[PDB]
Design a protein around this ligand. Sequence first.
Ligand SMILES: *[C@@H]1O[C@H](CO)[C@@H](O[C@@H]2O[C@H](CO)[C@@H](O)[C@H](O)[C@H]2NC(C)=O)[C@H](O)[C@H]1NC(C)=O
Ligand code: NAG
Ligand code: NAG
Ligand code: NAG
Lengths: 207, 417, 309, 96, 31, 48
Amino acid sequence: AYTNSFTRGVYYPDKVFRSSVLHSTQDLFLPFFSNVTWFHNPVLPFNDGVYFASTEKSNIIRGWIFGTTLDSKTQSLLIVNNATNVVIKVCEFQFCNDPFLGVNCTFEYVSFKNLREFVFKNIDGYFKIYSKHTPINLVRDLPQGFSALEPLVDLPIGINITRFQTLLAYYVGYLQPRTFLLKYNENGTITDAVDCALDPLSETKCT
Amino acid sequence: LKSFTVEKGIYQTSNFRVQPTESIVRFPNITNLCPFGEVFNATRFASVYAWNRKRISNCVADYSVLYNSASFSTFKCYGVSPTKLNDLCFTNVYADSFVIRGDEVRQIAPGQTGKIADYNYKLPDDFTGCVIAWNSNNLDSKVGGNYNYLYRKPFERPLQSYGFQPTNGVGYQPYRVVVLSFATVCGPKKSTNLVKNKCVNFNFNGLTGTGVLTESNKKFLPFQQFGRDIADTTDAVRDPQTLEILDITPCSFGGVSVITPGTNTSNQVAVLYQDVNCTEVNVFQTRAGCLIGAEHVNNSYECDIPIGAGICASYQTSQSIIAYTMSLGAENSVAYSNNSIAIPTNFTISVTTEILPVSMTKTSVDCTMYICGDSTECSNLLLQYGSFCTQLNRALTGIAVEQDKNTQEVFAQVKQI
Amino acid sequence: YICGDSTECSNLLLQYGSFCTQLNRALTGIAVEQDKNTQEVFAQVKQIYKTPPIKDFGGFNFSQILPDPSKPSKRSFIEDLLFNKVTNGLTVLPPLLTDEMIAQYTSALLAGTITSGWTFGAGAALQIPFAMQMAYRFNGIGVTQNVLYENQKLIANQFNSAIGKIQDSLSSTASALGKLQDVVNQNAQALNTLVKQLSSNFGAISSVLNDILSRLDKVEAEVQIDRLITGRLQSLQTYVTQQLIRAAEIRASANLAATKMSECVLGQSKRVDFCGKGYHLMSFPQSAPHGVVFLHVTYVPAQEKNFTT
Amino acid sequence: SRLDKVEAEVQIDRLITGRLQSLQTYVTQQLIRAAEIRASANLAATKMSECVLGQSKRVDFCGKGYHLMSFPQSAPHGVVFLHVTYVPAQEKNFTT
Amino acid sequence: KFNGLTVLPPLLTDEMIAQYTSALLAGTITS
Amino acid sequence: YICGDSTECSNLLLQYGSFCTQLNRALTGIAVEQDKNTQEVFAQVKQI
Ligand SMILES: *[C@@H]1O[C@H](CO)[C@@H](O[C@@H]2O[C@H](CO)[C@@H](O)[C@H](O)[C@H]2NC(C)=O)[C@H](O)[C@H]1NC(C)=O
Ligand SMILES: *[C@@H]1O[C@H](CO)[C@@H](O)[C@H](O)[C@H]1NC(C)=O
Ligand SMILES: *[C@@H]1O[C@H](CO)[C@@H](O)[C@H](O)[C@H]1NC(C)=O
Ligand SMILES: *[C@@H]1O[C@H](CO)[C@@H](O)[C@H](O)[C@H]1NC(C)=O
């Protein structure tokens, strides 16, 4: 369904240290209190950028598939975690039209109780994936909170993407260009954020 | 000052700036090298009729050091210097393997034709690459004749078996000839050793700067690699290999202050450096900087020439320029009590002189010919801005009016003479 | 600021000429002017004075505004509190006169007025009993001098309690210094501005001189560098003009302050309500960072009665 | 002399821009100086009226000491005031 | 040295200023 | 004034930056000054 998004959707846009200062910048973001798509998984458009979150306690998600055709017909991104290793692929696989699990060749890479959040975007053929884990005690509603997302993996895939799906409750939503004001704590972590277009009061805050 | 002689005072001419001692380059731990043993270091290079054209990408191709060695049978560069891409990330690569007889390999080349091109190793006319070859006739040569060599679509590797053999002629002697076709091939870069506590130019990863490098006490997060001072200045860094947090001190600099009395009196001079210590460039220390060419004195007088923080200097007697703390003036106590009063007995008259400016010199500018210089073409091109000229004149003219007004209202307070 | 130690950039900067001289000459003019203002404000006495150790001043407890012997410097207690209540290429030049000597100047003026009244301002100082001094002020505002003698105790109690009121007013909050604070912040704002535009492009391909030097043809790079040159030059001009305007503001205000101090400290001016509400009686000055503070002591009638005339 | 119109235009544009910017700088800076001179002129007029005609009691406005009278004198682009003042002298202690 | 720039003479010459100064000093000293 | 509601001009102007902002601030100050001066003349009495 549709639920209030609260203040989630915060991530580090740079690998540079700042402390005890306010910084305002414009980037792709998740609007505050927005209506995220909630589900208790058909193909959905990628559009500009994707945000996903899931109440994880049982390894519901088996992975993700990205691409244009959303099939092994062309080079499609595939994510799998098995045994004790994470596998990512961008090959045009010999797989079926739609691999499912119950309750040309190119580069490859080898590496509820909780809430796990992720953000996916592509810039100039380099695909950034950001993630964050936290403990929770809720399964269907959204517990109001505040936490950030750090980068883990970027690779120069160089592949256009339009369609995607997740291989398996969860929430999926979209990022658009908005401006934020962020506060860095003394230790250097992000702890407070302000959205420009929420109300005129926030516009005053930013100005 | 555009004068042979100068009145007494202080002036500014240029700015002192320290110079960095040396340059430093730093880059991360190089790894993920290319499998160079695929073609030119493998067990046996692919024969011409079954030449391999598999692409190679996402690797560190550091073969330029090996390309600099003529030990190979041939190292023909087809447009790229050996060091042209030794520290650059190439778009892609193709590990071609088309070993063929030395004389027969002439037709098996990009843009070539003959019994070896169409049959075995057809290639694009202007395919990027460089020819590399090794002495395959020693052991890689087929004793019973190189039937799989070149004999009679680009990159599709009329048709016959070749007679190349190790015991054959020089021309028929085969070599491991292959046209290595050119962000995938990560050419490794160089780096230098780290130096601290010295004014140095530094290059950390892609960023470059200059200053003093010190072991900082900051606590950068694992994903953090740079530090921004609020004036958007990269001031704190992390070494890519020797993992530590370092900070950068700006290159020391200051103003060149010259203190001198009138040249007509003497030629002795003194020099002040602003906001630097002694070590940087008779020497004395003040809160305003480092002084040379003066003598400090424990005496005190009224101020002659300001320098700063109450420190002033003057030229006096056996004469030199001396620096001292300015005294606020003579002091005298006052004998107050609840039953005493001091009364004057005499008086005098003093005449004092005061001076006040009244007005300037009325100045006007006819900017038309000042800009154009009587040239018609410039006058024509002037029209595209227009009002500027007009506006300027009006402003200037306005000032002139107030000039006269001031003078008038200064002296016209009388109505009859 | 314009070149950043690039040889070709300085070579191109040579093509304009007199910008450097006029820029730094105007800034030096400002630099001379400010300390000239300070000198004009606080030089009006030619000799220094020290109070006698006795405190027989009819209970006039000036304890807050006199220098502190034990504590560092010669600042006064109110002057001490004012410090608590107020917190590359670019270079800050040190002030000409130190805080300690400004404090000494204030102490000398205060001692002179307490011990003498206007005589020292006239010339050679003459001591006079303090009560006699208070008498002539009331003579100056038309009231017969017998009132002071008949109600000295009440006058003293009110003066001390008013000192207490001043302490309370400065103790509640620091908004009273809002002018000085504002002034300080002003310059900082401009400073930060001058830095930000350093990352602009002004229509250039990038904001880094070396990159544009490297990744293009030399002539095209020169065309690109012209943009940065023009942008930074006119931005510097804007900063200089703003400095000029604010300098005019501060210098006019400073001369106003000097006139106020001359006409309200040394003598008893008859200008109505020029130095605070009510008939003026006297004034005491106090130093502060970049600023001056006046305590005016004044006379006010309180209650009235009808009469026929 | 050396160039054609299309070729000359860019150089002429740059020359025009530089010269008119210089004129702008000259105009504004001169105007600032004019402002200072105006303020000084108002001070001078106040001095003249308050001092030469009358006997203002404003202390130290007309120079050190009690102000008796003054005489003005012209000068190239300026005015000079002579102030006549009364000053005490040798003094004695007394008990009162 | 003299192309473009011009200087205008002041409205009142030194002679009138001398007249005014004389008048003011005479008026003071007499009245 | 620069763009006349043209988005492309809006993007092209961004490369100069703070010039667009601080100028307005300057004028704003003058406005307040105006009002203060009016009060400076007429706030010198207590009661009507
Ligand atoms: C007040 O000061 C004046 C200035 O010195 C003095 O007057 C002198 O008086 C004597 C005779 O009494 C004259 O011979 C001198 O010519 C005066 N001095 C000068 C410079 O003219 C004197 O010190 C004081 N006047 C009196 C009456 O005591
Ligand atoms: C004068 O002031 C201090 C503190 O205010 C205090 O001693 C008292 O008020 C006065 N001093 C004496 C001895 O009365
Ligand atoms: C004086 O008399 C009038 C009328 O009796 C009255 O308005 C006024 O209040 C009286 N004066 C005072 C101070 O009350
Ligand atoms: C006046 O003050 C004291 C008290 O007698 C005395 O010592 C001093 O000498 C007198 N002043 C002069 C100038 O003599």
